[PDB]
Amino acid sequence: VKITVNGKEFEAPKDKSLIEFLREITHVPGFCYTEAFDPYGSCRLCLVQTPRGITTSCTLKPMEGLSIETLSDEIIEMRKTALELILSDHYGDCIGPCQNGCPAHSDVQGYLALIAMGRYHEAVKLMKEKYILPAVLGRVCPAFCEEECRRNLVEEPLAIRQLKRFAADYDLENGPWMPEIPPSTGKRIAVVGGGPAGLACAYYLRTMGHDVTIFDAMPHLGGMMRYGIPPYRLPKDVLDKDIATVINTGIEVKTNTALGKDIALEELREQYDAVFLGVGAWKSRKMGIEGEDLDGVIHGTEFLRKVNMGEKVELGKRVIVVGGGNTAMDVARTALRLGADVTVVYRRSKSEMPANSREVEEAEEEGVKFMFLTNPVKIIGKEKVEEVELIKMKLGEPRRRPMPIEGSEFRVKVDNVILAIGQYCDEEFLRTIGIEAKRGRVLVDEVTLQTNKEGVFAGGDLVLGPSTVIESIATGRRAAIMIDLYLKGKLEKAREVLLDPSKHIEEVIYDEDLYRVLFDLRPYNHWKKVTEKDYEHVERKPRVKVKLLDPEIRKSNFKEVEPTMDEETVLTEAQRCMSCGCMEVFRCKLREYATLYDAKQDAFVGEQNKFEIDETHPNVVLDNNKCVLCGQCVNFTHEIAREGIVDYLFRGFKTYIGPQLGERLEDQKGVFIGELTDICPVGAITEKLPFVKPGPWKTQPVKTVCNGCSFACEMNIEVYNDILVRASSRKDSWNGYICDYCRFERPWAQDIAQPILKGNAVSWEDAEKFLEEKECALILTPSLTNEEIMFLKELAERKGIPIGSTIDGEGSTATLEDIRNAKRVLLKVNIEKYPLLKLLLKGKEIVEEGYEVAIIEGPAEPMDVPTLILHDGVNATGLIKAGVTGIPEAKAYVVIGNSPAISKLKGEYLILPSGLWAEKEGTVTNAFGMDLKVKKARKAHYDVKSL
Amino acid sequence: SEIKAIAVGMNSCGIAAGARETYEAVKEELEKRNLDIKLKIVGCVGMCYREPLLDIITDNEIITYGHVTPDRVPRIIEEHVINGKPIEDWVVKKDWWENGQRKTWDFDGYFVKQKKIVLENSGYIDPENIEEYIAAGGYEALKKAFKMKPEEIIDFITKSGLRGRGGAGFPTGLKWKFTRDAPGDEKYIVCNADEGDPGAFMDRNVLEGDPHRVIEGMIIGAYAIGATKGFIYVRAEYPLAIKRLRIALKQAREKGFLGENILGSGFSFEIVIKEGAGAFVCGEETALIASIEGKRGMPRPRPPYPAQKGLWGRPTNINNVETWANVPWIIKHGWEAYAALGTEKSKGTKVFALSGKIKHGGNVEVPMGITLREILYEIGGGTKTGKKIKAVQLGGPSGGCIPDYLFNTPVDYESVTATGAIMGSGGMVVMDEDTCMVDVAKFFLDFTVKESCGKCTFCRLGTKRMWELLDKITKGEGALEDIEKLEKLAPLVKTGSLCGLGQTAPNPVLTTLKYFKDEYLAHIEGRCPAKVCKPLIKYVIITEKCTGCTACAIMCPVRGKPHLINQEACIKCGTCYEVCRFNAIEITDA
Amino acid sequence: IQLEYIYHYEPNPSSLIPLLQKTQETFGYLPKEALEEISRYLKVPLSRVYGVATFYAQFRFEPL
Ligand SMILES: Cc1cc2nc3c(=O)[nH]c(=O)nc-3n(C[C@H](O)[C@H](O)[C@H](O)COP(=O)(O)OP(=O)(O)OC[C@H]3O[C@@H](n4cnc5c(N)ncnc54)[C@H](O)[C@@H]3O)c2cc1C
Ligand SMILES: NC(=O)c1ccc[n+]([C@@H]2O[C@H](COP(=O)([O-])OP(=O)(O)OC[C@H]3O[C@@H](n4cnc5c(N)ncnc54)[C@H](O)[C@@H]3O)[C@@H](O)[C@H]2O)c1
Ligand SMILES: Cc1cc2nc3c(=O)[nH]c(=O)nc-3n(C[C@H](O)[C@H](O)[C@H](O)COP(=O)(O)O)c2cc1C
Ligand code: SF4
Ligand code: SF4
Ligand code: SF4
Ligand code: SF4
Ligand code: SF4
Ligand code: SF4
Ligand code: SF4
Ligand code: SF4
Ligand code: FES
Ligand SMILES: [Zn+2]
Ligand SMILES: [Zn+2]
C-alpha cells in the first residue's frame, strides 16, 4: 500500500507499524516501542495528524491513501506538552553543576574520573574539547566551576582547577596531546588579537579545517596573558609551552602587524573569508577628575606592561591604586614586589569585588592595604602628585550604584597614583574602522556575536569589557562556531533555531550542523533542586591543600606562589567526586527530545514521586526517579526472558517498575538482568562500571562477539580511547541480547598474563626454551579466531609438528531458522549453563521422543534430526574446516589458552596465553555455523601468532 | 380479585433503604395473623426515592405503597388484606391491566413520560423464580430466536438501531456481525457489568431485578454469533447480583436453556460468572479482557478490536447489561416497535440515573430524542427545594456539565455529544445555584486521577497537573495564567490519551470553562460565589439573630448568649449552618 | 495446611485473580508464603502476582 506523509508520496509495508517507516523517513519521538513486543501506547509521543484526528503512529498500520502530518503546529504543541509533562516527573541532573558553572561548559566530571583512573593525557584531551590552555586556566582561572559544585553541599568543592593544573603539567612535560586536524575546507580566517579569545577562535577554527592567521600588535602571543597577568601567577615558560600547544596546530602568527596601522579592516575583509576582533580593551579608562595630568599619575595596564616587558618604571614608596578588578590586584601585588607601600581603592564593598578572591586573600597575606567604599575626587600637587582627596562612598537601594557621601575629605599624602578603573578599546579607532561600539565596547548580537559589518565577529574584553580568560575563550569558541556557520551560509537559520528550535524542527533534523550547534550551545539540562539535606549520606573527605610560598619571602620576588600538587594526592582528590551527572546523559532520549522540542522543566510543576535508588545489585542500578514508564523492561522480562525480574507496581501517578514487595534486584535469580540497561531509554536502569569513577564519557561502540560459550553472541563494546568500559547489545544482532555472565564476569576483558609451565609464571624466554627443546604437540583451545587457527595449522604443516585441540567431535547441523521454526525439541544439555537457550527455546515443546530438533553436549555425533551441539569455546566450530582433531597423545604439549581439559594431558604442558579477546580482529564460527566478525577495541599489545 | 401475593423490592437500593426489615416484618405478620398469601421479593421498580416498596397483587390490579417501614406494615396488612380498603394516602403507585397492556398511575407523575423497555419486568416478577419470568412472557423470545437463523437475528438487531447502551453508542448489530464474521471457531461473549460510576447503578439493577432478561439476551446473542462460553464480568463488590445470577443460571440450566443441547437445537452454551476485583478502568473492554486473563487491567490500543482478538486471542463480543436486556424485547416485539421510538440517529430508550439535587430521582426509562427539561422538571420534578437548576452533568465523573439554558437540547447521542457532555454511564447529577462548578470539576478530576491505570503519559501526568491547577484555583492561589494553562492542557489531554478514561477526563473542566467561566474568573479574586470552597470563605455568627443554643460551638468540634467563633483557627467544615436554630450563622467571605 | 485452597483452582494463570480473592477471604490479606505457592502452582512470576495485587486497591499485604 502507499501513503502520503507531509504531502510526499511514500510506499510502506502493510503489516509493520507506521512508526518504523516514519522514523526511517522523519523524526518521530517515542519511548515505548520495539519490534519484539506488541505496540504499546504508554508514552503518546509518536503522534501524527490523520484525517480522523491525531493518533499515535506505532498503533497505526498503513492504510491506502492515508495522509500523515508529522510536524503540524498542533503536533508540535502536543509533543512539547507531553515532554513537559514527562519532565515534570523526571528527577536528576543531566550534567553536574560544575559543567554549568564553567563559562566554557566543559565536561568536568569526565576528566575528573580520568584523573582518578590515572590517565592524565585523556583528561587533558577531554579538557581541550571546550577550552584551550588548561595549564594557564589551572593557574589563573577564577574557578567558576567550584562556585556551585555539589561538594559545596557536603564539605568543600572539588579541586578542579588544581587537578586540571596537575594533568596539564603532566601532559606538557610527558609529551603534549595534539588534536587531529580535519582536511582543509579551503577557507582562511583572520584573527585580530593574540589574546585568549583570538587563540580560542584560531584553535577551534583550525580544528574544523579552516586555516587561521592571527594578527597581534605586540611581538608575542597571549596578549594580556603575557603583558598583563604578572609572572608570579603565570610563569612565561608555562605560557610559552601552552601557546606552543595551541600554535603547533598550524596557526600562522603575524606579530607587529596591527589593524589600523598596517592593514585596514576593509582590506582585511577583502583579503579574508572571515574576521574576528579579539583586540581586547588595551586602552585604560580615565577616571575623569580634575588634575589627572599631574606627573606621577600612570595607568595600571601601562604599569603592568612596563614591568612585564622588562623596562624601568619609576615607582615611589607610597602608591595608591584605583580599581577593584583583577588589574588593581595585579598592579598592587606587582608594586609591592618592587618596593612600595601600595593601597587599593574601590567604590564598592568586598563581596562585589570583581577580582579573583584567592588573589585578594593572597594580597592580604603579602601586605596590600585595601580601601573599599572610597573614590578619588581630585589629585593635588604643583606638578607632581603629592596628595589625592577621596570621599567615602555608600551605595543605597535603587543595582545599588555607588553614590558618595556628602563630605569626608579623605586626603592622603601619596607619591604615585595608578588608575585601573577599567578598560575599553579606542573610540577613535573603533570609529575609523566602521565597527559600531558603545563606551568602547563593541555592539554585537548576543547569539551570533556579529558586528554591524558583515563577516566581522567580536568577543573577549572588546565585547564583555572586564572579562576573564575563560569567558574570552568561551566567546572565541562561540565565534568559531558562528564563523563556521557563516562560512557555509547557515548563520540566519542557526540564529532563528538558537532563538527557538521548536519552530524549525524539520530544519534542525535535516542539517547535521544545526543539530550539532543546538546540542552544543542550547542543550536541555535537567536540574535537581538540591540543598544540604540531599547529601547527608556521603562520607566527608578533606580537600587537599597545596603549600604556597611563604608570604614574607613571597613579597620580595617574582617567583611562582602556588606549585603543582603532589602525584600522591591527585587520586585522593579526584576520588572525592560524587558523580552528579546522569550516567546516560549521552544516550538519554528524553534529553534529546526536550532539546529538539524546546521543553521547559518549569512549565508544569507539582508533586513528583521520590524513589530511593536500588544499588544493592552487584552490577545493575535501578533508579525509578528517572523512569518514564515505557514498560519495555517489564515487557522484556515477562515476555522474552520469562524471568519476571521486575513488573509494574501500583497504578496511576504512583506507578513504578520494581522487582516485588520486600525484595530488591540482588535477590532475583535471573540471568538477563543486565539486558535491562540496554532496554531502558532514559537511564533508569544503569550498569555499575568497574572503574573507581565511572564519570560518563562519549564512548564509541565497536562490533565484536562474545567468548563466553559457543553461541558467540554479537555485542558492542563501549570504548573511550583504549578504555574498555562496558558491553552493550546491538539491534542488528541475531541474538539481540547478551547474558549477565558476558557483561559482568567479562570473559572478553581478561586473559592470562604469563605462560604457564606446571603452575609457574615463567617468562617468554623460558617458554621458548621449553618449546624449542622438546617436540611437543600443538593443542588449540577454541578461544582463537579463524585466522589464528589457520596460521597455527599452516605453521604445523610446514614445520612438521602434530596439531590438535582440546575438543573433538563433529556436527551442529541445526541452523537458527530451524530452531525458530521447529516445534518439538529434545533437551539434554543443562539449560542454566547456556542462557541464550532460555530465549531461543521459549514456548516450544520439550519432548523425549518424536523430537524435530535436539540439543546435545560436546563431544557428540550429529543426528538425522537437526541437532545442536554446544561446546564451551567461542570458535569450537573451527574444526568444521581445519579438521584439527584431538590430542595426538605425544610427550609434553604446548596449548594456546586455558581449559579444564588441560589437566587430562599426560606430561608437562606449556600453556601459551591466547591473548585478550577484545584486542583481536578476525572471523569466528558459532554453534549455528554463521561467520561473525570480531573487531579490535584497542591496539593489540601482544600477538598470539608472533609468540 | 382476592389478594394473591405481597411483594417487596429487594434490589441493592431496596436493601439499603431497609427492605430486609420490611420483608421480615411482612413474614412475621403473615405468621401471626394466619394467612396463606404468597410472599415474594421483586426488583427495584424505578421509584428509588420512596423505598421500601410493598406491593399488594390481585388478579387485575397492583397497589404499591411507598416508604413502608416495619411500623406501618401492621396497618397495611390489617387495612388491605384483612378488611379490604386501600390507604390512599400511602398509595404511591397503582398498576392495572387494560386490553393486555400495563397501565400505571403515579402520585408524583413519575411514569407519565417513561417508556419501560429494559425495566418492564423489574418490580413485578420474582428474580429468583424462573417460573414467574416464564409466565410473564419471558424466554418466548428465546424460542422464537431459536426458530430463526442466526444471521436473521443479527439483521433483526441491526434494523432496530439498538446502539451501544454502554456509553459510546456503537451499533450493537454491527458489533455482533463483526464478532460472528471474525475468523475462528471458538468464541466468547462477555456481559459488561463492571459499572464503575459511583452514581449509576442501572446495569446492576438489571442484573438483580431481571437477571433472566440478561441471560436470555446473552443466549440469543450467542446463538447469533456462534459462541460456546459466556462470561458475566460483574464486580465481587456486588454480592446480591452474583447470588441472583448464580441461582438464575442454575435454574436455566435445569430447564434446558443452558448446557448441552439447548432446546434440541444442537447448541451448547454455558455461562461463567467472572468477578473483577473492582476498578473503573477494568470496565473498559481491553482492560476487562486483561483482567479476565489474569493480568493487570491496563487498556491496550483498540484498533486490534476485542471482537477480533478478545479473551485469549479468540474473538469476544462485549456488550453492556442494558444492551443485552434490550435484545429480548427486540426479538419479541420486532424491530418495527424499537424503530418507532426515539430520534432519527438514536432509536430506542435510554436508562438514566437521576441524582444530585433532583426531586424525583431514580432510574428512568425514557425515549431517546427527549427534551432535557422534560426529564429535569416533569419526570425529575425539578430540584428538591424549588431552587433553579444551574446545570446538569451527564456521563458520570467523566462527563460534561450542560447549562440550564440548553435544556431544550434533545437527549440523544449526537446532541449530548455535540453539546459538550457524553452519555457515559447514563447518570445525571443535578447542580443548582448553591453549587460551585470549580469544586465539581475538581471532584471529577480527583476521581479520574484516582482511577487512572497509569500507563500513558497524558492521562497519568496531565490529569494530575489539571487537578493541581484546579486545587490551586480553588484555594484562591490562581491567576489568569492558570486558566490559560488549563485551556491549553485540557484539549491536549483529551486528544492525547489512549483509553476513554483520559479522553473523557477533561470533559468537566472543558464544559465548566465553556459555560461557567464566571466562577473561574471570580475564584481568581479570592471569592467563591456559591460559598462552598473552604479556604475562600469563613463562618461568622450574627448577634442580631442568634440565641442561646449553647451547642453551636459544642456540636461542631471547632451560655444563653450569642456564642463565639474562632475564625482564625476554624476548619470551615460546616457543622453549624445545618445544625442551627433559626437563621443565626451567615457564611460570608474571609 | 491453609494453602489447600490453591488446589481447587485450575493451575492456569487466569485463576490468579480468583485465587487472590480467595486468599483475601481466607487470611484477610495476601501472605508471603501463600503468594509464593500461588506463583509456583500457577507457574507465574511473583512480580506479576504482586503487580496484579497492587493494581487493585482492595488487596492488602499487611496482616490486617
Ligand atoms: C585571574 C585573572 C587575572 C587577570 N589580570 C589581568 C590584569 O592584571 N590586567 C589585564 O589587563 N587583564 C587581566 N586579566 C584579563 C585578561 O586580559 C584576559 O586574558 C582577557 O579576558 C582576555 O583578553 P582578550 O582575549 O580579549 O585580549 P587580550 O588578551 O586583552 O589582548 C588583546 C590582543 O589584541 C592585540 N591588539 C590590541 N589592539 C590591537 C590593534 N589595534 N590591532 C591589532 N592587534 C591589537 C593586543 O596586542 C593583544 O595581543 C585577568 C584575567 C584573569 C582571569
Ligand atoms: N471493528 C470493530 O469490531 C469495532 C470498531 C469500532 C468500535 N467497536 C466497538 O465499539 C464499542 C465502542 O468503541 P469506542 O471506541 O467508540 O468507545 P470506547 O469503547 O472507548 O468507550 C468510550 C465511551 O465510554 C463511555 N464511558 C466512560 N465512562 C463510563 C462508565 N463509567 N460507564 C459506562 N460508560 C462509560 C463514554 O461515554 C465514552 O464515550 C467498543 O465495544 C468497541 O470494541 C468495534
Ligand atoms: C473508563 C471506562 C469505563 C467503562 N465502563 C463501562 C462499564 O462499566 N460498562 C459498560 O458496558 N461499558 C463500559 N465502558 C465502555 C466499554 O469500553 C465498551 O465500550 C463497552 O463494553 C461496549 O458496550 P456496548 O456495546 O453496550 O456499548 C467503559 C469505558 C471506559 C473508557
Ligand atoms: S539524562 Fe535523561 S534521565 Fe538523566 S537527568 Fe537528564 S533527562 Fe533525566
Ligand atoms: S576553566 Fe575554570 S571554571 Fe571552567 S572547569 Fe576549568 S577551572 Fe572550572
Ligand atoms: S561532585 Fe563532581 S560531578 Fe558533582 S558538581 Fe562536584 S565536580 Fe561536578
Ligand atoms: S525502568 Fe523500565 S519502564 Fe522505566 S523508563 Fe526504563 S525501561 Fe521504561
Ligand atoms: S549466551 Fe554465551 S555467547 Fe551469548 S553473551 Fe552469553 S556467554 Fe556470550
Ligand atoms: S488515559 Fe489513563 S486510564 Fe487510559 S490508558 Fe492512559 S493512563 Fe491508563
Ligand atoms: S447554632 Fe445558631 S442559634 Fe445556636 S448558638 Fe450557634 S449561632 Fe446561636
Ligand atoms: S462548623 Fe466549622 S466553620 Fe462552622 S464554626 Fe464550627 S469549625 Fe467553624
Ligand atoms: S505511544 Fe507510540 S511509541 Fe509510545
Ligand atoms: Zn432503585
Ligand atoms: Zn468556589
| DSSP 8-state symbol, B342 | B
Cell numbers that stand for A752 in this block: 592470562
First to last CA, chain B: 67
| β-strand pairing of B410-411 with B370-371 | antiparallel
A742 is in an annotated binding site: no
Tell me whether the omega of the peptide bond preceding residue B52 falls within 30 degrees of 0, making it cis.
yes
Q: Tell me the residue type at A130.
A: K
Other beta carbons less than 10 A from residue A801's beta carbon: 16
Beta strand B270-276 pairing with B229-235: parallel
Bridge pairing between strands A756-757 and A760-761: antiparallel
Bridge partner list, A282: A424
Q: How was this structure determined?
A: cryo-EM
Distance of CA A605 to the CA centre of its chain: 30
Q: Which residues, 6+ apart, have CB-to-CB distance to A213 below 8 Å?
A: A188, A189, A190, A191, A251, A252, A254, A272
What's the grid cell of residue A646? 521486575
Listed residue (B162, B559, B110) closest to B359, CA to CA: B110
Residues B523, B476 contacting (CB under 8 angstroms)? yes
CA-nearest of A107, A308, A102, A281 to A197 is: A281
Beta bridge partners of B389: B432
d(CA A510, CA A497): 13
Delineate the domains of chain A, giving CATH numbers in brackets: 2-71 (3.10.20.740), 97-177+539-574 (1.10.1060.10), 188-225+239-282+426-487 (3.50.50.60), 297-419 (3.50.50.60), 609-749 (3.30.70.20), 756-934 (no CATH)
Q: Which of A116, A95, A91, A94 is nearest to A107 (CA)?
A: A95
Q: Ligand 1: which of A279, A358, A449 to mutate, judged by most atoms within 8 Å of the beta carbon?
A: A279
Which residue shows C-alpha cell 549455528? Answer: A928
Q: Are strands B400-403 and B389-394 parallel, antiparallel or unpaired?
A: antiparallel
Q: How far apart are CA A466 and CA A355, in angstroms?
A: 10
Q: Name the 3-class secondary structure at A903.
A: helix
Q: How many angstroms separate the alpha carbon of residue B556 from the centre of ligand 11?
A: 6
Instruction: Give the integer Cα–Cα distance in Å for A105 and A95.
Output: 10
* Cell numbers that stand for A257 in this block: 602587524
Handedness of CA A243, A247, A251, A252 (dihedral sign): positive
Query: Do A681 and A632 touch, CB atoms closer than 8 A?
Result: yes
Cβ(B285) – ligand 3 distance below 6 Å: yes
Q: Largest alpha-carbon pair distance within chain A?
A: 120
Q: How many CB atoms lie within 10 A of CB A265?
A: 19
Burial zone of A580 (CB within 10 Å; 0-12 exposed, 13-18 middle, 19+ buried): buried
Helix (H, G, I), strand (E, B) or coil at B52: coil
Residue C4, judged by CB atoms within 10 A of its CB (0-12, 13-18, 19+), counts as exposed
Q: Name the DSSP letter for residue A643.
A: -
Q: Going by C-beta distance under 8 Å and a sequence separation of 6 or more, which residues neighbour residue B297? A: B276, B279, B281, B282, B284, B287, B288, B290, B291, B453, C55
Backbone angles phi, psi at A478, to 5 degrees: -60, -40
Would you say B288 and B295 are in contact if contact means Cβ atoms under 8 Å apart?
no
Could you tell me which CATH class the domain B349-432 is placed in?
alpha beta
Q: Is residue A97 within 6 Å of ligand 6 at its C-beta?
A: yes
Q: Which three cell numbers stand for residue B452?
A: 487512572
Query: Which parts of B182-255 fold into alpha helices (H)?
Result: 202-209, 211-225, 239-254
Give the nearest partner residue to B278 out of C12, C13, C56, using CB atoms. Answer: C56
| Gap between the Cα atoms of B508 and B514, Å rounded | 10
Domain layout of chain B by residue ranges: 5-110, 135-335, 349-432, 437-525, 538-590
Q: What angle do CA B439, B442, B443 make, to 5 degrees?
A: 90
**Strands in B385-542 per DSSP E:** 389-394, 400-403, 410-411, 427-432, 540-541
What is the spatial distance between Cα A463 and Cα A456, in angstroms, rounded to a whole number?
A: 13
Contact between A858 and A832 (Cβ < 8 Å): no
Cα gap B175→B315, rounded to integer Å: 11
Q: Quick count: other Cβ atoms within 10 Å of Cβ A453?
A: 17
Ligand 9 near B460 CB (within 6 A): yes
Residue C46 in contact with partner chain A when CB distance is under 8 A: yes
The three-class DSSP label of residue A840 is: helix
| Cβ distance of A652 and B453 shorter than 8 Å | yes
Fill in the amino acid letter for A544: V
Tell me the DSSP string of A46-69: -EEEETTEEEESSSPPP-TT-EEB
Q: Choose the closest CB to A651 out of B303, B454, B488.
A: B454
Residues 6+ positions from A594 with CB-CB distance below 8 Å: A83, A87, A524, A526
Whose cell is 466468547? That residue is: B188
**What is the C-alpha separation between B281 and A870, in angstroms, rounded?**
49
What are the angstrom distances between the C-alpha of A804 and each of A657, A675, B138? 52, 37, 88
> For every residue of A160-209, which 3-state class applies, written as one string?
HHHHHHHHHHHHHHCCCCCCCCCCCCCCEEEEECCCHHHHHHHHHHHCCC
* Other Cβ atoms within 10 Å of A60 Cβ, number: 21
C-alpha cell at B524: 481568581
Evaluate: CB of A160 within 6 angstroms of ligand 5. Answer: yes
- Hey, of A15, A61, A81, A601, which one would you mutate to test binding to chain B, going by the most B CBs within 10 A of its CB? A81
Strand A341-346 versus strand A318-322 pairing type: parallel
- Please tell me the distance between residue A337's alpha carbon and the centre of ligand 4 in angstroms: 51
Sequence letter at residue C60: R
Query: Helix A73-89 to helix B480-496 angle, to the nearest 10 degrees?
Result: 100
Indicate whether residue B317 lines ligand 2 (CB < 6 A): no
- What is the distance of C-alpha A394 from the center of its chain? 46
d(CA B327, CA B325): 5
Q: Kind and range of the H or E element at C41?
A: helix C32-42
DSSP A443: P
Structural contact between residues A659 and A669, judged by C-beta atoms closer than 8 angstroms: no
Number of cross-chain residue pairs from A and B with Cβ atoms under 8 Å apart: 94
Amino acid letter at A372?
Answer: F
Compute φ and ψ for B460, nearest 5 degrees.
-50, -40
Q: What does the H/E/C string look like for A766-794?
A: HHHHHHHHCCCEEEECCCCCHHHHHHHHH
B526 grid coordinates: 479570592
- Burial class of residue B506, CB neighbours in 10 A (0-12, 13-18, 19+): buried
Question: Which segments within B268-372 are labelled E, that is strand?
Answer: 270-276, 316-320, 349-356, 362-367, 370-371
CA-nearest of A286, A318, A546, A300 to A427 is: A286
Quick one: CA dihedral B533, B539, B545, B551, positive or negative?
positive
Instruction: For residues A113 and A698, give the distance between their C-alpha atoms in angstroms, rounded to a whole number.
Output: 13
Q: DSSP string of B347-406?
A: BSEEEEEEEESBSS-EEEEEESSEEHHIIIIIIS-SBTTSPPEEEEEESGGGSEEEEGGG
Q: What angle do CA B250, B254, B258 make, to 5 degrees?
A: 75
Provide the residue type at B357 as one letter: K
- In angstroms, rounded to a whole number, what is the distance separating the alpha carbons of residues B497 and A41? 9
- Residue among B275, B294, B297 minimizing CB distance to C13: B294
B243-262: burial string, b at 16+ Cβ within 10 Å, e else? ebbeebbebbeeeebbeeeb
Give distance in angstroms: CA of B566 to centre of ligand 10.
14
β partners of residue A276: A191, A457
> For domain B5-110, is the CATH number 3.40.30.10?
yes
Instruction: Give backbone dihedrals phi and psi of B58, rounded to 5 degrees, phi first.
Output: -115, -175
Q: How far apart are CA A494 and CA B391, in angstroms?
A: 53
Q: How close C17 comes to chain B (CA, Å)?
A: 6
Give CATH superfamily name and number for B135-335.
NADH-ubiquinone oxidoreductase 51kDa subunit (3.40.50.11540)
Number of Cβ within a 10 Å radius of residue A387: 15
Residue partners of A855: CB distance under 8 A and separation at least 6 = A825, A826, A827, A828, A829, A837, A841, A867, A868, A869, A870
Half-sphere exposure of A676 (CA within 13 A, CB side): 33
* Secondary structure (DSSP) of A213-266: EEEESSSSSSGGGTTTS-TTTS-HHHHHHHHHHHHTTT-EEEES--BTTTB-HH
The residue whose grid cell reads 530544519 is A507
8 Å CB contact between B138 and B121: yes
List, in sequence order, every residue forming a beta bridge with A620; answer none if it has no partner.
Answer: A687
**Contacting residues of C for A660, CB less than 8 Å apart:** 46-47, 50
Residue A935's contacts (CB-CB under 8 Å, 6 or more residues apart) are A702, A703, A704, A921
Cell 515443546, residue?
A845
Report d(CA B507, CA B494) in Å as an integer: 8
Secondary structure of residue A16 in the 3-state scheme: coil
Contact between A624 and A90 (Cβ < 8 Å): no
Residue A412 gets the label, from left (phi > 0), alpha (psi -120 to 50) or beta, of: beta
Phi and psi (nearest 5°) for A85?
Answer: -60, -45
Q: Give the CATH number of domain B437-525.
A: 1.20.1440.230
Q: Which residue of B has its CA nearest to A32?
A: B456
Residue A653, all three cell numbers: 501517578
Give residues with Cβ within 8 angstroms of A824, minimum separation 6.
Answer: A844, A845, A846, A847, A850, A851, A852, A853
Enumerate residues 6+ apart whose C-beta is below 8 A from B587: B531, B537, B538, B539, B540, B577
Q: Report which protein residue has its CA nearest ligand 7's atom 8.
A: A630
**Cα gap B67→B53, rounded to integer Å:** 6
Q: Which residue of B has its CA nearest to C53?
A: B296
Q: Which three cell numbers stand for residue A804?
A: 590438535
**Gap between the Cα atoms of A202 and A195, Å rounded:** 11
C61 interface with A at CB cutoff 8 Å: yes
Three-class secondary structure of residue B64 per DSSP: strand
Residue identified by cell 437475528 is B153
- Omega of the bond prior to A859 within 30 degrees of 0, cis? yes
Residues 447-486 of B with CB under 8 A from A: 449-458, 460-462, 464-465, 468, 485
The dihedrals phi and psi of A413, each to the nearest 5 degrees, come to -85, 115
Query: Taking a C-beta distance cutoff of 8 angstroms, is the pair A756, A910 a contact?
Result: yes
Q: Distance between terminal CA atoms of chain A? A: 60
Ligand nearest to C-alpha B455: 9
H/E segment holding residue B413? helix B413-419
Phi, psi of B246 (to 5 degrees): -65, -45
d(CA A129, CA A208): 12
Alpha helices in B516-558 (DSSP H): 517-522, 552-555
Q: Nearest CA to A544 among A106, A157, A121, A115?
A: A157
Report how far residue B472's alpha carbon sits from residue B450's, in angstroms, rounded to the nearest whole number.
Answer: 18
A67 within 8 A of A6, measured Cβ to Cβ: no
